[PDB]
PDB file of C-alpha atoms in Angstrom:
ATOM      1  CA  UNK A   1      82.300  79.886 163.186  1.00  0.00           C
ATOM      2  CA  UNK A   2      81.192  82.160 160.340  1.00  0.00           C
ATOM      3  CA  UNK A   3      83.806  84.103 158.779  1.00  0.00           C
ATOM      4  CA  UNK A   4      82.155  86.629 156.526  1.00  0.00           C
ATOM      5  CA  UNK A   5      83.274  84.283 154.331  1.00  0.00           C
ATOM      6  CA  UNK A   6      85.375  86.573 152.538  1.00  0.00           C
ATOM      7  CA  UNK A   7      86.051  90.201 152.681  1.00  0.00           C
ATOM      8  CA  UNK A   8      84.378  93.350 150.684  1.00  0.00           C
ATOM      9  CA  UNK A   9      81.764  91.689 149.389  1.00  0.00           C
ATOM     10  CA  UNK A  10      79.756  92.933 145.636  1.00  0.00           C
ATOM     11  CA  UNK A  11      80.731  96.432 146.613  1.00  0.00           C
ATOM     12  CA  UNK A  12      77.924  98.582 145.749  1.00  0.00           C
ATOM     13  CA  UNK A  13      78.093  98.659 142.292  1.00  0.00           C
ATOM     14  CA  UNK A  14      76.390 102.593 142.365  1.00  0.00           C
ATOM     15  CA  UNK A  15      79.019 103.148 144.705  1.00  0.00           C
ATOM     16  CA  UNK A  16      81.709 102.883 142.609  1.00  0.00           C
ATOM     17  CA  UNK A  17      80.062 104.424 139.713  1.00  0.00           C
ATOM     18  CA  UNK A  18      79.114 107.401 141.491  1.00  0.00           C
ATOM     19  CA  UNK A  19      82.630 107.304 143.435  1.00  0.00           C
ATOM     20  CA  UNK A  20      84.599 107.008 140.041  1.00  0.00           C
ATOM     21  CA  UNK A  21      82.767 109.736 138.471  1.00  0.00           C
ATOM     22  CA  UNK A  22      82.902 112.480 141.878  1.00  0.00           C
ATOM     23  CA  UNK A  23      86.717 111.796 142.464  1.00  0.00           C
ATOM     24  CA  UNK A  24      87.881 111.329 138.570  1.00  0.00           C
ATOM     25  CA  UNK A  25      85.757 114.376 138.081  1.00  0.00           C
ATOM     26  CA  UNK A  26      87.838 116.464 141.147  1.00  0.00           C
ATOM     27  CA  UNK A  27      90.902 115.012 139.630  1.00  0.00           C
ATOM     28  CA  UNK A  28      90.491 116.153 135.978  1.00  0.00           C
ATOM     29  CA  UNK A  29      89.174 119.701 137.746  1.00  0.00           C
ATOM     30  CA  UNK A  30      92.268 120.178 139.955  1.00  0.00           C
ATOM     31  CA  UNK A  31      94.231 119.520 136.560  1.00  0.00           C
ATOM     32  CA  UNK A  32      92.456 122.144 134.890  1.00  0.00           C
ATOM     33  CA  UNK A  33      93.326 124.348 138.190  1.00  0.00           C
ATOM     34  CA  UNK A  34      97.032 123.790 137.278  1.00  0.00           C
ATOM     35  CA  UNK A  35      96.865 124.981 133.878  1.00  0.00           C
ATOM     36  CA  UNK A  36      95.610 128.100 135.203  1.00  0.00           C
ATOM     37  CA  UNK A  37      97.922 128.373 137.666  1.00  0.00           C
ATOM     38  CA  UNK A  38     100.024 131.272 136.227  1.00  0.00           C
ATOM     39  CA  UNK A  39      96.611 133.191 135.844  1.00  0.00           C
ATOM     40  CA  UNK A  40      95.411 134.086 138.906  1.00  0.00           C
ATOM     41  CA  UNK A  41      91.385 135.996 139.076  1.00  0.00           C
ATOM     42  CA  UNK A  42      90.443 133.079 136.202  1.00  0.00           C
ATOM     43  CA  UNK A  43      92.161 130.495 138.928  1.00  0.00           C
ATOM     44  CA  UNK A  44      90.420 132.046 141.948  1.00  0.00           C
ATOM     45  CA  UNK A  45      87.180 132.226 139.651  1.00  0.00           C
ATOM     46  CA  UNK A  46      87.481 128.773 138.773  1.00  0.00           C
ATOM     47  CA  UNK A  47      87.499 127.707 142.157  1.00  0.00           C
ATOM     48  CA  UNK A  48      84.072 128.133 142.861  1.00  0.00           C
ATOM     49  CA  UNK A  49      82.324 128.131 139.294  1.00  0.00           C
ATOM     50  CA  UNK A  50      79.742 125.278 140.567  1.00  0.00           C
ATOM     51  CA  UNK A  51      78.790 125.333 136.794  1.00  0.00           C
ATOM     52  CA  UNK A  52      81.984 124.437 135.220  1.00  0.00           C
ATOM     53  CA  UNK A  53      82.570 121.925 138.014  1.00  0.00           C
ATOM     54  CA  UNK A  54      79.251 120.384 137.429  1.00  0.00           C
ATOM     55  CA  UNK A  55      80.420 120.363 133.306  1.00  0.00           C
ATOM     56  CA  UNK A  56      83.248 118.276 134.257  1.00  0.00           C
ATOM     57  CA  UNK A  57      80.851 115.689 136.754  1.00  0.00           C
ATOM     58  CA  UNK A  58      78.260 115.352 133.387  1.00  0.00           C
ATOM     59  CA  UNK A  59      81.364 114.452 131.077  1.00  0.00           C
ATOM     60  CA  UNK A  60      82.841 111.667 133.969  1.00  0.00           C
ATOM     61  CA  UNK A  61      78.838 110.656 134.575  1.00  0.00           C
ATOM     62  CA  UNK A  62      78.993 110.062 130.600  1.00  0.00           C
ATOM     63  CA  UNK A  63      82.513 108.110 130.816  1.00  0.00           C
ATOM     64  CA  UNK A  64      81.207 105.848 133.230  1.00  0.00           C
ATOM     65  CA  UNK A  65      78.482 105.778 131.491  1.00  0.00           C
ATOM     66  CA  UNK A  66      76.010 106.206 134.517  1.00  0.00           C
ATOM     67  CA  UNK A  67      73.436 108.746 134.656  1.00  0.00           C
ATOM     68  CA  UNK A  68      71.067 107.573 137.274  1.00  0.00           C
ATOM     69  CA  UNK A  69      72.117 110.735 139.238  1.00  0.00           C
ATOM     70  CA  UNK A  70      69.199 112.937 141.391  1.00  0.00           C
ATOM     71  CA  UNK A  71      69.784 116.229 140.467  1.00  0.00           C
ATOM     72  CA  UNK A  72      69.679 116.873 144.859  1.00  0.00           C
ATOM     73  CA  UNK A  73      72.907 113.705 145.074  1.00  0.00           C
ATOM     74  CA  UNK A  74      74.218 115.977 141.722  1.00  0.00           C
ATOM     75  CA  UNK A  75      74.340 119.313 143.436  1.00  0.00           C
ATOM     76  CA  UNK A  76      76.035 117.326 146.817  1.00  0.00           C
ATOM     77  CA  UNK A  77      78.513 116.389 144.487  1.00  0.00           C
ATOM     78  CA  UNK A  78      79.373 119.623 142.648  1.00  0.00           C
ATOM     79  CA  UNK A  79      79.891 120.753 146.336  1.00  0.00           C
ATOM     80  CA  UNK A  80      82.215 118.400 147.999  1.00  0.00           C
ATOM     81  CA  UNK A  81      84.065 118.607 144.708  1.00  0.00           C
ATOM     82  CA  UNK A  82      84.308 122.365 145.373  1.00  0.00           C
ATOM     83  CA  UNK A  83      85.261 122.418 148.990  1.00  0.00           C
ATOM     84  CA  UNK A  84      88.391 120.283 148.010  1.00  0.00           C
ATOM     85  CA  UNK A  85      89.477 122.757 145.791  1.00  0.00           C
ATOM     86  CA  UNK A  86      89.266 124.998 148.675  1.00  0.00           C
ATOM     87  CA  UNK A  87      90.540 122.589 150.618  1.00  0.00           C
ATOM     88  CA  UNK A  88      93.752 121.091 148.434  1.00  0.00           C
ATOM     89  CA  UNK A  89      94.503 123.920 146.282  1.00  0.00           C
ATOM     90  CA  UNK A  90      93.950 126.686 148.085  1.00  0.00           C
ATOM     91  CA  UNK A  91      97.506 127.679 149.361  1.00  0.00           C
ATOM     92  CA  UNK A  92     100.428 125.754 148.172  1.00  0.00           C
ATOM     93  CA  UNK A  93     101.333 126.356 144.420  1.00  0.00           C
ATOM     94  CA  UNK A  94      98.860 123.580 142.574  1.00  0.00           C
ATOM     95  CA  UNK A  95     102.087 122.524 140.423  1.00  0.00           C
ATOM     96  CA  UNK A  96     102.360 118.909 138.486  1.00  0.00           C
ATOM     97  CA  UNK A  97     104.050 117.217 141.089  1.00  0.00           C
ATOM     98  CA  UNK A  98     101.347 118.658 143.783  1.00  0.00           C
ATOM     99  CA  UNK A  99      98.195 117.344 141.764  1.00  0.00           C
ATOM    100  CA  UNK A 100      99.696 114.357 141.529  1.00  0.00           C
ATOM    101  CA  UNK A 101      99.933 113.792 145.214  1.00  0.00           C
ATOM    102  CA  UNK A 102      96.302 115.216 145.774  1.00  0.00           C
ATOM    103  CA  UNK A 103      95.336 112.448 143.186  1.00  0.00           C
ATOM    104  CA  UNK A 104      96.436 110.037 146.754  1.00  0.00           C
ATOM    105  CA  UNK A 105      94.056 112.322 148.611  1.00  0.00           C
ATOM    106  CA  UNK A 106      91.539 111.281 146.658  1.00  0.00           C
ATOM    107  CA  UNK A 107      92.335 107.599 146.603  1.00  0.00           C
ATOM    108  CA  UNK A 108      92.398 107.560 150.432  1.00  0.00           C
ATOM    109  CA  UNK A 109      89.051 109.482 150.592  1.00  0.00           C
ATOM    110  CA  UNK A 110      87.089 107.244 147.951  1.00  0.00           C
ATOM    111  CA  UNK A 111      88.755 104.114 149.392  1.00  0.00           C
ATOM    112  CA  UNK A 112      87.072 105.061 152.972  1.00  0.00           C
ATOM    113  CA  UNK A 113      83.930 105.703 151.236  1.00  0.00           C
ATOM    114  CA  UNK A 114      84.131 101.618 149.602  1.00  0.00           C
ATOM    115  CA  UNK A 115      85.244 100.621 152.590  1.00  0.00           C
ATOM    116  CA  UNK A 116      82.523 101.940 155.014  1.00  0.00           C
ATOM    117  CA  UNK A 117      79.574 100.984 152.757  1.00  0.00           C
ATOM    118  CA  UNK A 118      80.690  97.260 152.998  1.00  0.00           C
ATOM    119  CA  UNK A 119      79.968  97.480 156.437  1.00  0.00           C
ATOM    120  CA  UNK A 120      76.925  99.759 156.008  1.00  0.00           C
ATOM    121  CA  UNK A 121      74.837  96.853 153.616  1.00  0.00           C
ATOM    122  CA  UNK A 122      76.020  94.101 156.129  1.00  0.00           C
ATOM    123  CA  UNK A 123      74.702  95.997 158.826  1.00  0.00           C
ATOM    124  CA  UNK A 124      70.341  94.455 159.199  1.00  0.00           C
ATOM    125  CA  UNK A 125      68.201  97.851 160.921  1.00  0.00           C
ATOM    126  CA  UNK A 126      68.258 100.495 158.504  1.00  0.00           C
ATOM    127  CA  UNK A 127      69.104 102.770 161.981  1.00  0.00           C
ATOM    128  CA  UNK A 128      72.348 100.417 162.078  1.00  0.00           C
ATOM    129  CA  UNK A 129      73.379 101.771 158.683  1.00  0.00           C
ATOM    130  CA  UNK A 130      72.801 105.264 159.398  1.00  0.00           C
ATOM    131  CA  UNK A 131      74.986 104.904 162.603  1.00  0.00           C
ATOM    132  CA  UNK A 132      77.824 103.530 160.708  1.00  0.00           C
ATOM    133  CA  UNK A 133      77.442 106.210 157.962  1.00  0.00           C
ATOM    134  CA  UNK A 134      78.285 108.748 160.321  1.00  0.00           C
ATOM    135  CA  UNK A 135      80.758 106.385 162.769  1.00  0.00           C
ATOM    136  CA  UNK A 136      83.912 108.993 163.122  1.00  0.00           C
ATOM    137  CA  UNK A 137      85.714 106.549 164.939  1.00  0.00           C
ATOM    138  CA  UNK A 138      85.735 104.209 162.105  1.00  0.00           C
ATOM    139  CA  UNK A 139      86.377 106.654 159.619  1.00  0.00           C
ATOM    140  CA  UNK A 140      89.185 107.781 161.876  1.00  0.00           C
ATOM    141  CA  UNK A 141      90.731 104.511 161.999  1.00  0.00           C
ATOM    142  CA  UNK A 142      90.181 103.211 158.323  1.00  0.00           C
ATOM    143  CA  UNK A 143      91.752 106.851 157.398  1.00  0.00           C
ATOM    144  CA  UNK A 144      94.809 105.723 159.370  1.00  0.00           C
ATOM    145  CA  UNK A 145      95.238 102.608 157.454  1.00  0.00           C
ATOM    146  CA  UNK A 146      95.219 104.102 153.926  1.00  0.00           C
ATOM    147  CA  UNK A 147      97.084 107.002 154.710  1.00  0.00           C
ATOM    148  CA  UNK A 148      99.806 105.176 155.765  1.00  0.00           C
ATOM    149  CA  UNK A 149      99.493 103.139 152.926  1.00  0.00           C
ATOM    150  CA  UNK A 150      99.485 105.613 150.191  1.00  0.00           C
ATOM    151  CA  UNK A 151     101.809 107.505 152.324  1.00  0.00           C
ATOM    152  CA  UNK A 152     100.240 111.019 152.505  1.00  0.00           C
ATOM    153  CA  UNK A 153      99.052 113.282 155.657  1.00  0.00           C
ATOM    154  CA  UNK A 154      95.874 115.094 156.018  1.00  0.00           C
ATOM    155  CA  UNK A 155      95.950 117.822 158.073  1.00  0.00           C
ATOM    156  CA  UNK A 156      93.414 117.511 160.909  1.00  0.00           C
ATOM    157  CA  UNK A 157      91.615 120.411 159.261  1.00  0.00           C
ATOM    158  CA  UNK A 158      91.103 118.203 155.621  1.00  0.00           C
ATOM    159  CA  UNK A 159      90.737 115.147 157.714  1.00  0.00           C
ATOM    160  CA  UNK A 160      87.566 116.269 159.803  1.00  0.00           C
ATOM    161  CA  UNK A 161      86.300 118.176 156.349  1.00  0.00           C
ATOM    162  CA  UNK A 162      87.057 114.803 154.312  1.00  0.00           C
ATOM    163  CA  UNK A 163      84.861 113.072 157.483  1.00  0.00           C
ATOM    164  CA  UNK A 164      82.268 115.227 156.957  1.00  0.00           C
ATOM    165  CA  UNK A 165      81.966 114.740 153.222  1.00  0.00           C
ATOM    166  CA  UNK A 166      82.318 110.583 153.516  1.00  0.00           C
ATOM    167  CA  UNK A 167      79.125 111.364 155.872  1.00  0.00           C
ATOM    168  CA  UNK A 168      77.650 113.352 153.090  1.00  0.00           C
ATOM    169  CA  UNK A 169      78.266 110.872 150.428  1.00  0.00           C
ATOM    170  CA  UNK A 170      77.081 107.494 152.198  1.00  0.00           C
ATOM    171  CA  UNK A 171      73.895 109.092 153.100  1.00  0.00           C
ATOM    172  CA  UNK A 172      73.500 110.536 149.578  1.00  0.00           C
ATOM    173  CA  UNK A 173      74.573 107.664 147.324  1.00  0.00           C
ATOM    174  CA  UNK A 174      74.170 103.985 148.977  1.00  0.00           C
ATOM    175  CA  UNK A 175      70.813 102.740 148.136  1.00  0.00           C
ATOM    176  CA  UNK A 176      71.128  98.624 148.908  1.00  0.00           C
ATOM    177  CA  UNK A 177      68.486  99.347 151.429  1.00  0.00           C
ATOM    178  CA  UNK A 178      65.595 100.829 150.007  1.00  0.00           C
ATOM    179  CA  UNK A 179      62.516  99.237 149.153  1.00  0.00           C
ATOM    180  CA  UNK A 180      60.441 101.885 146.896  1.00  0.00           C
ATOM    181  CA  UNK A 181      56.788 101.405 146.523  1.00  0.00           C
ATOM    182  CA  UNK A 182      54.913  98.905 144.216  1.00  0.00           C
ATOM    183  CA  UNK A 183      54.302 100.706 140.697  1.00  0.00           C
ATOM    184  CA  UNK A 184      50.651 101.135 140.549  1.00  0.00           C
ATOM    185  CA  UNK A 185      48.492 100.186 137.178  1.00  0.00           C
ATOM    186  CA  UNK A 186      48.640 103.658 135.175  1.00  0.00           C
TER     187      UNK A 186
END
């Protein structure tokens, strides 16, 4: 008998740098949504101003002080982070007491994200990990858990997007596997 020992092992710690500064940067953007609320055109422009959005992922990449970002996993980021403006904000009034409920959104989405790339670096083939990066059926299930538990219901149009993008950003951002080449003698 070998339990893993223990549960969630060193999560990534890139992960959670890169997770903390994609979802704190959505959060701090849907805020800015709300102030803008009673302005419609400058809301609707906001929504997809990939420039101002990427503004607000710089400042959160300089609050977590982590700038080892590819400018390709940068641009991925800018564009989840719009399509869940689309996605969260795009109908019901984006009040105070909405935004905070989206913040649970959020949690549930980055939590999946943690929790799938434990089981991505224990995985040993490389074509393991990819599987499990796009496994639907455990997304599905760990979305059940912490939905319930931060009590909060996707619809099954946000849940399959919010799939999609947990896809997007394991593929993007976990790098325990890769072995780059020797640095030649310049």
């Amino acid at each position: 008998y070998h339990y893993e020992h223990e549960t969630h092992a060193p999560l990534s710690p890139r992960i959670r740098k890169v997770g903390d500064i994609e979802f704190h940067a959505c959060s701090d953007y849907i805020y800015l949504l709300m102030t803008l609320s009673k302005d419609p055109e400058k809301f609707n422009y906001a929504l997809k101003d990939r420039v101002s959005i990427r503004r607000y992922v710089r400042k959160n990449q300089n609050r977590y002080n982590y700038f080892l970002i590819e400018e390709r996993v940068q641009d991925n980021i800018v564009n989840r982070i719009s399509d869940r403006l689309i996605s969260y904000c795009t109908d019901k009034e984006v009040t105070e007491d909405y935004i905070k409920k989206i913040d649970d959104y959020l949690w549930v989405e980055q939590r999946v994200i943690e929790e799938v790339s434990i089981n991505v670096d224990h995985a040993r083939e490389v074509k393991e990990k990819k599987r499990i990066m796009n496994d639907k059926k455990l997304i599905r299930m760990l979305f059940d858990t912490y939905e319930y538990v931060k009590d909060v219901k996707f619809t099954d149009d946000q849940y399959k997007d919010a799939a999609a993008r947990i896809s997007q950003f394991l593929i993007d951002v976990v790098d325990s596997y890769i072995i780059k080449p020797i640095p030649a003698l310049p």
